Write a protein that binds this ligand. Structure first.
Ligand SMILES: CCCCCCCCCCCCCCCCCC(=O)OC[C@H](COP(=O)([O-])OCC(O)COP(=O)([O-])OC[C@@H](COC(=O)CCCCCCCCCCCCCCCCC)OC(=O)CCCCCCCCCCCCCCCCC)OC(=O)CCCCCCCCCCCCCCCCC
Ligand SMILES: CCCCCCCCCCCCCCCCCC(=O)OC[C@H](COP(=O)([O-])OCC(O)COP(=O)([O-])OC[C@@H](COC(=O)CCCCCCCCCCCCCCCCC)OC(=O)CCCCCCCCCCCCCCCCC)OC(=O)CCCCCCCCCCCCCCCCC
Ligand SMILES: CCCCCCCCCCCCCCCCCC(=O)OC[C@H](COP(=O)([O-])OCC(O)COP(=O)([O-])OC[C@@H](COC(=O)CCCCCCCCCCCCCCCCC)OC(=O)CCCCCCCCCCCCCCCCC)OC(=O)CCCCCCCCCCCCCCCCC
Ligand SMILES: CCCCCCCCCCCCCCCCCC(=O)OC[C@H](COP(=O)(O)OCCN)OC(=O)CCCCCCCCCCCCC
Ligand SMILES: CCCCCCCCCCCCCC(=O)OC[C@H](COP(=O)(O)OCC[N+](C)(C)C)OC(=O)CCCCCCCCCCCCC
Ligand code: HEC
Ligand code: HEM
Ligand code: HEM
Ligand code: HEM
Ligand code: HEM
Ligand SMILES: CSC1=N[C@@](C)(c2ccccc2)C(=O)N1Nc1ccccc1
Ligand code: FES
Ligand SMILES: [Cl-]
Ligand SMILES: [Cl-]
Lengths: 49, 67, 75, 61, 49, 241, 377, 125
């Protein structure tokens, strides 16, 4: 998913203290404009829309 | 050029009281949002209600004309 | 396992029985049958019906809410 | 005081188990013909002129 | 004291051919057996089919 | 996650519990699939031989199979080649695989129709209502190019242009090929495609009900016969004093 | 008399002919043999399906199709097997409800292995529904197998070890078919131990009072009643087979499995919906899974919760009402389980979920203590 | 003593523990249990082969290949199952020969169903 600037600053300007698996957007991706995930829910394996 | 039993039933279906009311509520919604375009309020809901009451009465007597 | 002749102790009890070819398999099937069904349902209806009526009311309310909760409001 | 049909059936057919079983197997044979004959006749009289058995005569050639 | 015993009346359950306590039961023994065994025979016919 | 409108129940002549399909309407419905639908929709599980003795003769169905060319082989040289269809061939697929299908249909995949009536809630009621239910979009809905408004499709935006209309074909028996006629015939055929056992199961169902109406009271009578010894037994308690 | 001394016919005699049985057991005692019949039907229809089914993703969907269209009378065999499984679960739930209402759980050995018989049937029907390899088959198989990922530390290892890969694929469908084939024979073996422990004591009866003073032989009295019951069991099955085969089946299962997108709303078969509701009632992974396990393993500790000085509920009105509030509550959880996680079904699903565990663990144990004091003992 | 009264362990006791047996039965009487073991081995190796085998002519040959090359330790499972079947028939033929030489066939019921056990194994293999 190619992330825009409306989305980078939404997920960058978030508090991380209350996150369930806390980690800033830096650790996740390699570069700020790219999110490469794998489509399985961490609950029980369904793919999210 | 060629007739259609489908279209004749629908015009005599929209006459009963239950169907004109749905027509009046969507014709209002046809002029409510198009007062001046800007909103995101679509008007799909008021159409599906009109089709529900309409397509109920077609199924009653539509098949009486076919083979 | 358990056998006949080793079950329990019984004294002074008489049982009269008739052959099945001497009597009727459906005697007073409707004459005595229906009044007995009415007594049986009457005796238990208050213990069975309420929880299933309670389910019926939740079932209609929950669907009625859900069926219209996704309707739109003017705001 | 002629015995009814049920009594004459017992004396002749049912008293012996062998003859009781013979007429079950024979009863099955003749019941099968008349049941599938009559039953199929109802299923198609309901659905008259609806399935291939009826319209077979159009497309013979 | 065991002579005080009497078998209770079964007229509420007896078949029509038997309620006459002054008429022989053998006069109807073949019709009554035949009716019950006719039920069984037609049953096995259907299971056979 | 949109609003849904479910289809009404149309009085199909095979709706009743004991009511067979109308095989003349099946015959007409196959003609709709061949001429109109088969160019976009596969039917991977129906073969020409399945038609024999339902709506076409063996000779008719053979002639129908030979009207198309299918691949066969290898021959003795190791090459594949084309020959006319025979009764044992399945209906030709319009595309070799779904990726070609999306490319030929603006990215959408026409599903196989062998089971379409059984894989969607409402069966022929849904399909009949969908085909005959196209209309202009309501005020405020603007669909992207390539997509078509249809209120019975989930989301109301479907990638299939209306595929049927007055006079798309002429029927062999002269029946007027009205949109509603075409929808009714193709829907009856699609029911047969998804459930060829339809008529035979209802004939069996009738025999099952009749036998049960006999056997249930007779077996009930045997139960009551044996149990009558107990149900009319009488007890008495005579303790010594 | 050879019926009583031949070492083989001896065991038959002491189980079906001369076995003493109570004289007053009602139709709720018919479901034991109907379970046996259901099992036999699932063996035979199952076996004759396995002669035409193939166990690999490419043609697993097509081989079932091949049965319903091409093999003589395979469509009827297949719907018998599909609807036979549902009749199996009707009989299972009546069987258990009979045991709870009339207090038959006091037969600890018989009861506690009965719980085992419930789990193995669920495991069977689970691995049976995967085999046709439709959409519901695939993603229903995905949700279930991922329940083991909730176990701490060893979760993911057990899932991928069960899978034989990194997701449910060809390797799972093959072993699940092998498991689905062999488990119904294990069931029959345990059902034989079910009877062995049962005959140690004999049957309970509607009153909860010992029937030693008034027993009748099993034959001819309960042989014929079990026949009549079975004939009503065939009626129930054949009405589903021959007039409504896809009433309980979901339409989505008629599209081949797609490992890339789910349906917008998935629902188990009816006989698992009450338990799926309990799972979704908790916004926690491991919490939902444990609440699901205890939902069924609650049966194992019913005997420890018996407080009444009487055995059956026939003479306990206050327990009767709480018993039927559990059936309605279970009927409620079944409804939620068939509905999407949305308002107000969510909060209803949680209230009915507490009411389930609240009844068994609190209200019914204390309700028996009350009625003991109302009867002065 | 619970070993003698538990309805389940009673049947085990009277068959493997306190069962009276002759004091002089030779190694030819060992093959009864080896048949049981052989059967158990053919169940287990058989079962674990059935989790990777496919039953259609196009890939039936290839699925067995797939076991002997790709699945962990499936080649050993497969040869155990193949050679286990042959060991089964060694034990069968010793079992019968023991019965003939020493006259055990006079147990008609045991013997006559033993014949049935021979036919069904042949039909299996
Ligand atoms: C089909 C679904 C049926 C659900 C079962 C409903 C309860 C029932 O009547 O069981 C019949 C039947 C009678 O058995 P029983 O040994 O005579 O009594 C059992 C209880 O002790 C019965 O408890 P009880 O003694 O307190 O009495 C309850 C009463 C219940 O009576 C009723 O509620 C029927 C009232 C209908 C009146 C007619 C209106 C039409 O039972 C009856 O009187 C027999 C039913 C007569 C039906 C007549 C219908 C005409 O019991 C069952 O078979 C239960 C399993 C049925 C599940 C079938 C689903 C597949
Ligand atoms: C899934 C499959 C589930 C299998 C369930 C297993 C059922 C079982 O094995 O036991 C059957 C069990 C046997 O009942 P039973 O041997 O007569 O003894 C009942 C007690 O003695 C109770 O004595 P009672 O005098 O109170 O009996 C009342 C009488 C029912 O009283 C009536 O007459 C109600 C009928 C109202 C019709 C009004 C027309 C006038 O009998 C029944 O309750 C049976 C109802 C069946 C009515 C079918 C139409 C005949 O109950 C039944 O459900 C019989 C149904 C058999 C179908 C007969 C069709 C002809
Ligand atoms: C491996 C194939 C072996 C075939 C078995 C040959 C017969 C035998 O010795 O059985 C041993 C063994 C001894 O059992 P036993 O209870 O002491 O006596 C059984 C008969 O009553 C035995 O009948 P018997 O009392 O008339 O005596 C026959 C004699 C037979 O003695 C001989 O023929 C062995 C002579 C070899 C002398 C050393 C030259 C190197 O048995 C022995 O003395 C024991 C064998 C000693 C082997 C020493 C080898 C060094 O019997 C078996 O295991 C038979 C089944 C073997 C089949 C295995 C194929 C897989
Ligand atoms: C865990 C699985 C969950 C799956 C969800 C399934 C959906 C539930 C759908 C509800 C169907 C209910 C069936 C109809 C029951 C009618 C009972 C009735 O008519 O009579 C009440 C009877 C009272 O009779 P007595 O025995 O006290 O004395 C008789 C004196 N003449 O008393 C008795 O007869 C009661 C005997 C027991 C009834 C069995 C029904 C319970 C089913 C689920 C129980 C699961 C609990 C874990
Ligand atoms: C290679 C091809 C070979 C084909 C061979 C065909 C043979 C067909 C069957 C004929 C055999 C008849 C034997 C016979 O009737 O006796 C069995 C019992 C006796 O009934 P009963 O009335 O007790 O005594 C009769 C006494 N008599 C003869 C002196 C009048 O009769 C009954 O009681 C039987 C009634 C119940 C039958 C149902 C049993 C099936 C199991 C349950 C089915 C439903 C669920 C699975
Ligand atoms: C005979 C006249 C036809 C019938 C009956 C149906 N169609 Fe089509 N179709 C086409 C495309 C590109 C799609 C995919 C649309 C999408 O996925 O958004 C479809 C799909 C269908 C469906 C599925 C509806 C659903 O999933 O709920 C049905 C029931 C259906 N079609 C019926 C394209 C074409 C096409 C190409 C020109 C033709 C001739 C037809 N379809 C004909 C029929
Ligand atoms: C494949 C599974 C099962 C089979 C074949 C089976 C069969 C039977 C049979 C034939 C009986 C005796 C007749 C009767 O009461 O109907 C019985 C009794 C019993 N079963 Fe089961 N059953 C199964 C599962 C279960 C389950 C799931 C439970 C409980 C959770 C259970 C607990 C009991 C109890 C307590 C009794 C004694 C009832 C009494 O005699 O009053 N069984 N079972
Ligand atoms: C208590 C026993 C059993 C139960 C409850 C059961 C249940 C089921 C169910 C629910 C399905 C899904 C059917 C469908 O969705 O189409 C199924 C499929 C299947 N079962 Fe069983 N089964 C049992 C025993 C057996 C046995 C013993 C065999 C084989 C020896 C077998 C062979 C099959 C096969 C091959 C399929 C796939 C074909 C199909 O989907 O119809 N089953 N089973
Ligand atoms: C799967 C097949 C079989 C198994 C598992 C099996 C197992 C056994 C076992 C454990 C014994 C008692 C211990 C022993 O004497 O070794 C035995 C004894 C016996 N078997 Fe088998 N056997 C099978 C097949 C056969 C066959 C094929 C026959 C004959 C044709 C047969 C006839 C006998 C006889 C007569 C005895 C009594 C031997 C004695 O006590 O002296 N059995 N079997
Ligand atoms: C007494 C029991 C058994 C005997 C004697 C037996 C014997 C055999 C034999 C001789 C083969 C041929 C192996 C080959 O040529 O490669 C074979 C193959 C096979 N067996 Fe069995 N078997 C038994 C039980 C079982 C069971 C219980 C299962 C499954 C649950 C099973 C599953 C298989 C499979 C899948 C194959 C094909 C794979 C292969 O060829 O290795 N077997 N068996
Ligand atoms: C393997 S797909 C499956 N197997 C069934 C028959 C089953 C599950 C669990 C226990 C017994 C039987 C069932 O209801 N589903 N569906 C399904 C849908 C959504 C989530 C889970 C299962
Ligand atoms: S939320 Fe449970 S699977 Fe995605
Ligand atoms: Cl399918
Ligand atoms: Cl090989």
């Amino acid at each position: 998913r190619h992330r825009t600037k409306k989305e980078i600053d939404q997920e960058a300007a978030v508090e991380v203290s209350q996150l369930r698996d806390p980690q800033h957007d830096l650790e996740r991706v390699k570069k700020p404009e790219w999110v490469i995930l794998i489509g399985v829910c961490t609950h029980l394996g369904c793919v999210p829309i | 050029e060629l007739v259609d039993p489908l279209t004749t039933v629908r015009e005599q279906c929209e006459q009963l009281e239950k169907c004109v009311k749905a027509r009046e509520r969507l014709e209002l919604c046809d002029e409510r949002v198009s007062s001046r375009s800007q909103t995101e309020e679509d008007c799909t809901e008021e159409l599906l209600d009109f089709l529900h009451a309409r397509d109920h009465c077609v199924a009653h007597k539509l098949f009486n004309s076919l083979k | 396992g358990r056998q006949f002749g080793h079950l329990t102790r019984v004294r002074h009890v008489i049982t009269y029985s008739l052959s099945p070819f001497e009597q009727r398999a459906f005697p007073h099937y409707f004459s005595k049958g229906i009044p007995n069904v009415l007594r049986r349902t009457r005796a238990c209806i208050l213990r069975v019906a309420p929880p299933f009526v309670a389910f019926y009311l939740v079932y209609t309310w929950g669907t009625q809410e859900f069926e219209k909760s996704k309707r739109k409001n003017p705001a | 005081v002629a015995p009814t049909l049920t009594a004459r059936l017992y004396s002749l057919l049912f008293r012996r188990t062998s003859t009781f079983a013979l007429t079950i197997v024979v009863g099955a044979l003749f019941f099968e013909r008349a049941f599938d004959q009559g039953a199929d006749a109802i299923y198609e009289h309901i659905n008259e002129g609806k399935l291939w058995k009826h319209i077979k005569h159009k497309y013979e050639n | 004291s065991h002579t005080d015993i009497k078998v209770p009346d079964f007229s509420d359950y007896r078949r029509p051919e038997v309620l006459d306590s002054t008429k022989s039961s053998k006069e109807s023994s073949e019709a009554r057996k035949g009716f019950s065994y006719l039920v069984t025979a037609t049953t096995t016919v259907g299971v056979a089919y | 996650s949109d609003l849904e409108l479910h289809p009404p129940s149309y009085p199909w002549s095979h709706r009743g519990l004991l009511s067979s399909l109308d095989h003349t309407s099946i015959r007409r419905g196959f003609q709709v699939y061949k001429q109109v639908c088969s160019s976009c929709h596969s039917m991977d599980y129906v073969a020409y031989r399945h038609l024999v003795g339902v709506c076409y003769t063996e000779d008719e169905a053979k002639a129908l199979a030979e009207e198309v060319e299918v691949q066969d082989g290898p021959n003795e040289d190791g090459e594949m080649f084309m020959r006319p269809g025979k009764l044992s061939d399945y209906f030709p697929k319009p595309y070799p695989n779904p990726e070609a299908a999306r490319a030929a249909n603006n990215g959408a995949l026409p599903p196989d129709l062998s089971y379409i009536v059984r894989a969607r809630h409402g069966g022929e009621d849904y399909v009949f209502s969908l085909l005959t239910g196209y209309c202009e979009p309501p005020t405020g809905v603007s669909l992207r190019e390539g997509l078509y408004f249809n209120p019975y499709f989930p989301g109301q935006a479907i990638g299939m242009a209306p595929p049927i209309y007055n006079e798309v074909l002429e029927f062999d028996d002269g029946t007027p090929a009205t949109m509603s006629q075409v929808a009714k015939d193709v829907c009856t055929f699609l029911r047969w495609a998804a459930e060829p056992e339809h008529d035979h199961r209802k004939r069996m169902g009738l025999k099952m009900l009749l036998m049960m109406g006999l056997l249930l009271p007779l077996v009930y009578a045997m139960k009551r016969h044996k149990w009558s010894v107990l149900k009319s037994r009488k007890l008495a308690y005579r303790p010594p004093k | 008399n050879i019926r009583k001394s031949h070492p083989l016919m001896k065991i038959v005699n002491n189980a079906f002919i001369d076995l003493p049985a109570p004289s007053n057991i009602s139709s709720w005692w018919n479901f034991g043999s109907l379970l046996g019949i259901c099992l036999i039907l699932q063996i035979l229809t199952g076996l004759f399906l396995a002669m035409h089914y193939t166990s690999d993703t490419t043609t697993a969907f097509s081989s079932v199709t091949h049965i319903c269209r091409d093999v003589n009378y395979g469509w009827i065999i297949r719907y018998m097997h599909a609807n036979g499984a549902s009749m199996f679960f009707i009989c299972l739930y009546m069987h258990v409800g009979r045991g709870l209402y009339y207090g038959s759980y006091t037969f600890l050995e018989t009861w506690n292995i009965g719980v085992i018989l419930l789990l193995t049937v669920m495991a069977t029907a689970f691995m049976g529904y995967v085999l046709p390899w439709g959409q519901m088959s695939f993603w229903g198989a995905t949700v279930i197998t991922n329940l083991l990922s909730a176990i701490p530390y060893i979760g993911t290892n057990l899932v991928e070890w069960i899978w034989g890969g990194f997701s449910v694929d060809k390797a799972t469908l093959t072993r699940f078919f092998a498991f689905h084939f062999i488990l119904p024979f294990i069931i029959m073996a345990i059902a034989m131990v079910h009877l062995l422990f049962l005959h140690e004591t004999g049957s309970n009866n509607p009153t909860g009072i010992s029937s030693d003073v008034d027993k009748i032989p099993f034959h001819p009295y309960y042989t014929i009643k079990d026949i009549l019951g079975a004939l009503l069991l065939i009626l129930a099955l054949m009405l589903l087979v021959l007039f409504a085969p896809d009433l309980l089946g979901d339409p989505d299962n008629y599209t081949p499995a797609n490992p890339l997108n789910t349906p917008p709303h998935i629902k188990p078969e009816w006989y698992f919906l009450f338990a799926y509701a309990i799972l979704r009632s908790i916004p926690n992974k491991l919490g939902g899974v444990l609440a699901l396990a205890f939902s069924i393993l609650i049966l194992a500790l019913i005997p420890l919760l018996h407080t009444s000085k009487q055995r059956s509920m026939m003479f306990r009105p206050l327990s009767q009402c709480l018993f039927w509030a559990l059936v309605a509550d279970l009927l409620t959880l079944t409804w939620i389980g068939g509905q999407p996680v949305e308002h107000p079904y969510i909060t209803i699903g949680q209230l009915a979920s507490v009411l389930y565990f609240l009844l068994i663990l609190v209200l019914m144990p204390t309700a028996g203590t009350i009625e003991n004091k109302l009867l002065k003992w």
